Amino acid sequence: KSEVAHRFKDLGEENFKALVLIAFAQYLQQCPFEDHVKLVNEVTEFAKTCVADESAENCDKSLHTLFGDKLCTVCCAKQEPERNECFLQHKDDNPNLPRLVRPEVDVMCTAFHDNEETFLKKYLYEIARRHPYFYAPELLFFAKRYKAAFTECCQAADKAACLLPKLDELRDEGKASSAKQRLKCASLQKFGERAFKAWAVARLSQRFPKAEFAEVSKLVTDLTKVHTECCHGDLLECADDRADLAKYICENQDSISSKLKECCEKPLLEKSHCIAEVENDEMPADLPSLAADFVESKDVCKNYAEAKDVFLGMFLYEYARRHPDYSVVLLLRLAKTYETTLEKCCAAADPHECYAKVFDEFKPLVEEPQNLIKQNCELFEQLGEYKFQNALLVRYTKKVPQVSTPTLVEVSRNLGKVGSKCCKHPEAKRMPCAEDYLSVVLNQLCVLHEKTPVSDRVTKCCTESLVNRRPCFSALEVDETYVPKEFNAETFTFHADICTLSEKERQIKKQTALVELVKHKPKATKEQLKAVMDDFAAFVEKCCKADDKETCFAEEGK
Numbered sequence: 001k002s003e004v005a006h007r008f009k010d011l012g013e014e015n016f017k018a019l020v021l022i023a024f025a026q027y028l029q030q031c032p033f034e035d036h037v038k039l040v041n042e043v044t045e046f047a048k049t050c051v052a053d054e055s056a057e058n059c060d061k062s063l064h065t066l067f068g069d070k071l072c073t074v075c076c077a078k079q080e081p082e083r084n085e086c087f088l089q090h091k092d093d094n095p096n097l098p099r100l101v102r103p104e105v106d107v108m109c110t111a112f113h114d115n116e117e118t119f120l121k122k123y124l125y126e127i128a129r130r131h132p133y134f135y136a137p138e139l140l141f142f143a144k145r146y147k148a149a150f151t152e153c154c155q156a157a158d159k160a161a162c163l164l165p166k167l168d169e170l171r172d173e174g175k176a177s178s179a180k181q182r183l184k185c186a187s188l189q190k191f192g193e194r195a196f197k198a199w200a201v202a203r204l205s206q207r208f209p210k211a212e213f214a215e216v217s218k219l220v221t222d223l224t225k226v227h228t229e230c231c232h233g234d235l236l237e238c239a240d241d242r243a244d245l246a247k248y249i250c251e252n253q254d255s256i257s258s259k260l261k262e263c264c265e266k267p268l269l270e271k272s273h274c275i276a277e278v279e280n281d282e283m284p285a286d287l288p289s290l291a292a293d294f295v296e297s298k299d300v301c302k303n304y305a306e307a308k309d310v311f312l313g314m315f316l317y318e319y320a321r322r323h324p325d326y327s328v329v330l331l332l333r334l335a336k337t338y339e340t341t342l343e344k345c346c347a348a349a350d351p352h353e354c355y356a357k358v359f360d361e362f363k364p365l366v367e368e369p370q371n372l373i374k375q376n377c378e379l380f381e382q383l384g385e386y387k388f389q390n391a392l393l394v395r396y397t398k399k400v401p402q403v404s405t406p407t408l409v410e411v412s413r414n415l416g417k418v419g420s421k422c423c424k425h426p427e428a429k430r431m432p433c434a435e436d437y438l439s440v441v442l443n444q445l446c447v448l449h450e451k452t453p454v455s456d457r458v459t460k461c462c463t464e465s466l467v468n469r470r471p472c473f474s475a476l477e478v479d480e481t482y483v484p485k486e487f488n489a490e491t492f493t494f495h496a497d498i499c500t501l502s503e504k505e506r507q508i509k510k511q512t513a514l515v516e517l518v519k520h521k522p523k524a525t526k527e528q529l530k531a532v533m534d535d536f537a538a539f540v541e542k543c544c545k546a547d548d549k550e551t552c553f554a555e556e557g558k
């Protein structure tokens with residue numbers, strides 16, 4: 001059994017070289033590009049000697065030992081069981097690498113015709129460094145779209161008018177995938193398979209309400225294996241198991257969903273990406289109420305005593321089928337309440353009288369997120385995306401001013417994008433959009449704060465139950481124990497480079513200074529904050545509009 005030969009023959013050389021490069025760029029993010037390509041080539045040539053003869057020397061070594069040794073040719077404490085854990089824990093979610101600049105379209109198109117491999121290979125390299133938890137088989141799909149964009153646009157007349165829209169759309173699609181995937185790995189490493197499996201049975205039951213529980217259970221167990229391998233660095237094992245899972249869904253389509261026909265006729269990488277973004281299938285007609293099998297039955301505690309989690313999974317499956325308008329987080333709350341009740345009632349002398357009114361306890365839990373979305377969307381339309389982000393900046397920096405300024409401006413801008421993405425939807429699609437998107441933005445705050453814990457209040461909010469992560473953050477309130485920071489003249493002084501920056505890069509500078517102003521005066525009236533912001537907003541365009549640009553900038557020193 002040669003694991004390096006098994007993965008090579010299942011994935012093929014092209015994906016093998018790509019998946020091995022990604023793993024190296026995520027384990028050693030600070031190592032240069034050309035050094036990793038030399039390691040990947042040597043690895044790929046070694047896999048060829050093992051597909052020919054599986055009994056050749058070192059072919060029996062595991063992928064962890066092979067990749068660990070090849071990496072440490074440049075934390076490597078002998079034993080491989082712990083050496084792979086040193087690499088995973090030292091992954092830097094903000095590795096402090098230089099921000100990538102995009103050259104002109106003719107500079108990139110010439111590099112695309114010159115050497116197409118190293119141009120696209122360096123694309124997978126630079127991305128895997130910045131996003132060390134990126135869904136590996138999903139990054140191969142983004143690479144193909146990044147190649148088709150240059151293949152089509154560089155032969156077009158106006159190459160810039162063609163390439164820039166497709167590259168800007170790909171950039172935003174990638175940042176969202178990385179955020180969604182980082183959440184999947186946090187729920188596994190910090191909460192276990194049970195937490196992730198429950199998430200999977202809820203999201204898939206809404207997506208596949210036609211499928212039976214055994215069909216959903218098989219998909220969930222296989223999908224958990226894929227993401228457990230992908231989050232633990234087993235990228236070759238991850239992309240192999242994902243392809244086999246996509247083959248099963250397509251060879252058993254009528255047992256899963258009806259919106260899988262056009263997905264199962266695309267190429268391999270498109271096939272898996274198509275199923276991950278498929279619309280929720282229609283609910284089967286005439287579904288009985290859950291009270292018959294979960295409350296009004298005399299065999300509720302009998303079936304629950306055999307396998308509690310399997311019974312709880314059936315309850316979550318049956319409840320998630322009938323409510324595609326509920327968020328996954330809400331569906332986990334209704335399933336945990338039904339669990340707490342069964343634990344109390346199945347030990348009593350009359351469990352039927354005890355859990356007869358458990359479904360009434362779900363009614364208050366449903367209306368809590370419905371009030372969160374309706375109130376904030378009504379304020380989003382009145383403010384606009386840019387004013388909604390600024391109002392969230394001053395509000396949340398008063399709740400927790402210990403969090404660093406780049407983190408506060410980061411998660412506040414992403415909450416404005418939740419209003420731009422979900423508030424347009426009706427009240428039906430508002431809850432699974434907003435509450436689940438709100439889950440991945442808070443996960444950014446948690447992870448970015450986990451690197452340097454400054455506020456113990458946020459840490460307790462992240463370390464507790466992730467299902468209760470949104471309600472714990474609502475009840476923070478202003479932190480009066482924090483003392484205002486002394487005024488720094490360099491944080492308010494601007495540079496002449498503010499002209500060359502884009503409007504989005506220039507408005508981030510202004511949202512940064514807003515956070516530094518509230519950290520200097522936490523007890524600042526909402527009227528006095530807009531007066532200081534609008535005053536510097538005038539000096540940003542007025543001083544740049546003059547011939548002596550940087551000269552008038554210094555004149556505003558007081």
Ligand SMILES: CC(C)[C@H]1CC[C@H](C(=O)N[C@H](Cc2ccccc2)C(=O)O)CC1
Pocket residue numbers: 372373376377380396399411415416418419422423434438470471473474476
């Ligand atoms: C649907 C959108 C308009 C969205 C906008 C923000 C709003 C919200 O208030 N979120 C906070 C999260 C938080 C807590 C503390 C610090 C930083 C963020 C919470 O209350 O959980 C929820 C809906």
